[PDB]
Structure formats: structure tokens, C-alpha cells
Design a protein around this ligand. Sequence first.
Ligand SMILES: C[n+]1cn([C@@H]2O[C@H](COP(=O)(O)OP(=O)(O)OP(=O)(O)OC[C@H]3O[C@@H](n4cnc5c(=O)[nH]c(N)nc54)[C@H](O)[C@@H]3O)[C@@H](O)[C@H]2O)c2nc(N)[nH]c(=O)c21
Lengths: 14, 182
Amino acid sequence: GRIIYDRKFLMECR
Amino acid sequence: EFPHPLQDSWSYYLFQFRKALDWDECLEKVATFSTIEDFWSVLTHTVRPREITYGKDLYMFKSDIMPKWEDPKNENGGRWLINVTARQDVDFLWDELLMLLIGSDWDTDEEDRQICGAVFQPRSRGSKLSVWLTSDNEEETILSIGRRIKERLELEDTIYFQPVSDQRSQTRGSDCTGKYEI
Ligand SMILES: C[n+]1cn([C@@H]2O[C@H](COP(=O)(O)OP(=O)(O)OP(=O)(O)OC[C@H]3O[C@@H](n4cnc5c(=O)[nH]c(N)nc54)[C@H](O)[C@@H]3O)[C@@H](O)[C@H]2O)c2nc(N)[nH]c(=O)c21
């Protein structure tokens, strides 16, 4: 299972 | 707050030219990261694209892949080349590009497999962003990657896919085509 994060989630983490 | 692991481990390099160093000796590895948290920490602790001095470049590559043509994963590959326009924010372009790569936000496993790394090159005559791919002849995958890059970076101008062979033979200062274009 490839680990995928969209930009919305990544930015929320930022 | 357990860290969020990435699909891949990545390494981040600065290219800084000094006299009498070979090209590859001007590269230095400033971080290796494998979590969303450490990805963002690298960016917060290194120079922003909009602040970088001309000719000092940023390379982000899957950790097992050296950021140079000579790597087995790069030697038969090619890059999507993006010519930055005056109106574009290079901070946005770089951040969106790296998010797309480290988040592996491609439709298919196969596209992710093609990915080697990304490069930011600030230049007086016009800056360049690139994504390096492992092959030069997986047309369908290469094209879907190019299409996704344009979407995520909100690019209007044509982007160019240039095999390593063409990159090697390119003359510094020549004014732009590709094996594929979109
Ligand atoms: C990716 N790559 C590049 N070179 C080599 O770098 C040159 C410039 O590329 P470039 O992509 O920086 O082109 P321009 O922007 O036109 O250069 P420009 O704006 O003129 O320069 C950008 C920055 O790079 C510096 N620089 C440019 N050419 C060289 C070079 O041949 N050796 C060294 N040490 N520094 C260089 C320059 O001082 C400035 O800081 C290429 O023609 C290749 O010879 C690579 N060599 C090897 N062996 N393996 C690689 O993977 C490789």
C-alpha cells in the first residue's frame, strides 16, 4: 500500500 | 504526535559553486527525512527559493538516488523542465512540487516508481524547476506525471521532457524543446 498524502493534509501538518 | 511516515525517504542537497571544485563536489547533503514532520522542518531551516542567490540550487531526491546523471536510476532517465515566469512565486512552485513528490500524490503506483527527485535552479535569465524521472521512454507514465505537475503547480506555459542525453549535450547559454511537451 503506497502512502499518499494530499496537499490539504500536508499543509495542515505544516 | 507520532510522526507520519512517508512512502519514501528523501535527501535534500544544496549546490554551491566554488572555484576549482568538480560539479559533484559542489553538492552537499543537508538533510535526509522520512516523515511529514521532518519534511517541513527541512524547509523551515533552509533558505526559501525566493531568497536564494543566483546559481545556488536545491535538489530533493529519494535517499538511495544520488542527485546526478551518473546514478543508475538517473542515467537512462530525463527531466520535466519548468521555465519560471516573472509573475510566478517560486516559493509556491517549490512547496507545491515537493508536496506532490513527498506526499506521492500521483494516481498510480507506477508514476511514483518513475520519480527520482526535484531541482530548483534560480537564474538571472529565468529560473527553472525540474522533476527527474528514471526512464525516458515510458511515454504514458511520463505524460501523466507531466500533466499532474502542471495541475499542482498551476502552470500555463509549455513544459518540456528532456532525456539525460540531451541534458548532457546542452550548451550553457543556449536559448528549448523536449522529447515530449505539454
Ligand atoms: C545536473 N548536472 C549538471 N552538470 C554540469 O553543470 C553544468 C550546468 O548545468 P545547469 O543545469 O546548472 O545549467 P545552467 O543553468 O545553464 O548553468 P549556469 O547557469 O551556467 O550555471 C549554474 C551554476 O552551476 C555552475 N556550473 C555551471 N557549469 C559547471 C561545471 O561544469 N562545473 C562546476 N563545478 N560548476 C558549474 C555555475 O557556476 C553556476 O553556479 C552542465 O552543463 C554540466 O556540465 C552536471 N554534471 C554531471 N557530471 N552530472 C550532473 O548530473 C550534472
